[PDB]
Amino acid sequence: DEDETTALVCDNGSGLVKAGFAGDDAPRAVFPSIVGRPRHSYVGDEAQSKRGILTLKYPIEHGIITNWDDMEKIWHHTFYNELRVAPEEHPTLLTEAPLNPKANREKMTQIMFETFNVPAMYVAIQAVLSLYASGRTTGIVLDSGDGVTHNVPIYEGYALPHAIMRLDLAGRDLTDYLMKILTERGYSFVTTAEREIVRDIKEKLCYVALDFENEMATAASSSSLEKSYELPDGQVITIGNERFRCPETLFQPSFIGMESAGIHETTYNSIMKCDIDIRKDLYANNVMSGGTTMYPGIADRMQKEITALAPSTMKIKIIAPPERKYSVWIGGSILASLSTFQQMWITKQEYDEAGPSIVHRKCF
Amino acid sequence: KREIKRRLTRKLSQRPTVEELRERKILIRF
């Protein structure tokens, strides 16, 4: 009923804000994480619609809130415009990136209480919420979004920070790479609007090959893998091996000049930083989450690559539900609506006494 | 659709302490 018994859940993405009501199966609002201010304020879709008279900024970079004034504008927009709520009437769960600095989570806490007067709030790690969305408290999550990719091992509900891996290769970088390789094929994409066209191409037509070399050979042997795509002006372009070369970058970051191992190897590295006693549990519970895990074929590719890295007899399971583009939000919706979670919120009374640093003893 | 909530509730209620996880070298602060 969206009343005082209902918590709010806001997932603060580098690319998209997902927001809604705890207990709902899907976010009520999904909008671009941008703020527009006069050239020479508006948020989200309205900011984009008025782009001709505004200059636009992303307040969240690689999963970390970096522009606080613009973030307050995003949160105000989220509550008042998108959800149509009074934040003083609802416990509010915010998400944070893995390894979010102490000062950052303190500031999130401060703003919720001092600006928005929430009665209660909590900050949860995005990857932990994705695990919870699958009904698990132990496993290793690969969360790949628009701005950052993380491998997060979690045992009994606790992320294990020493074993967390961060890779600053995610969806936006994949779009940029697709622009580059389409350009190679003859089709020029370079501007901000063109980057949005290519993001759409990526989401609609890209996929992950099970065997990259074999797929390259298939693409060379006939036009069977080619797809046509119509641009806004009516021009129709062809996409071929670019369909799978783009997300291949996740497995081979050298495609964009990065020295990092690919996401299968970072998954392995993260597991190996954890005690051997929980190893079987991690391998048997590999959860994929985030928009950049939506590529057809990626779960099968990860199953194959993890199998190649793991001991021969290890039981491997890749969990990648159809709803995984929103599983951070969905996990937050589940958690914030559990009766046994209600004792876990930081209350406004607790905040009044302890200040922002209370977040470190309440939220982990 | 709500089996997940039952499962999570039970698992969270049965979790070991942070102290136990540190003693088992699962959580490693330093």
Ligand SMILES: Nc1ncnc2c1ncn2[C@@H]1O[C@H](COP(=O)(O)OP(=O)(O)OP(=O)(O)O)[C@@H](O)[C@H]1O
């Ligand atoms: N079907 C799809 N195939 C490939 N990529 C997709 C698909 N759907 C969405 N994406 C990509 O996922 C990204 C958005 O995902 P998500 O909302 O998980 O990111 P975010 O939470 O805003 O970012 P972050 O967690 O990195 O701060 C965009 O790059 C987008 O293009």
Ligand SMILES: C/C1=C/C(=O)O[C@@H]2C[C@@H](CC[C@H](C)/C=C\CC1)O[C@@](O)([C@@H]1CSC(=O)N1)C2
């Ligand atoms: C359709 C929807 C998709 C999305 O993921 O949007 C987010 C947010 C968006 C902000 C700018 C854009 C012009 C505004 C609206 C697009 C929002 O930037 C992204 O498209 C960026 C640029 S291209 C790249 O893939 N991620 C991702």
Ligand SMILES: [Mg+2]
């Ligand atoms: Mg995210």
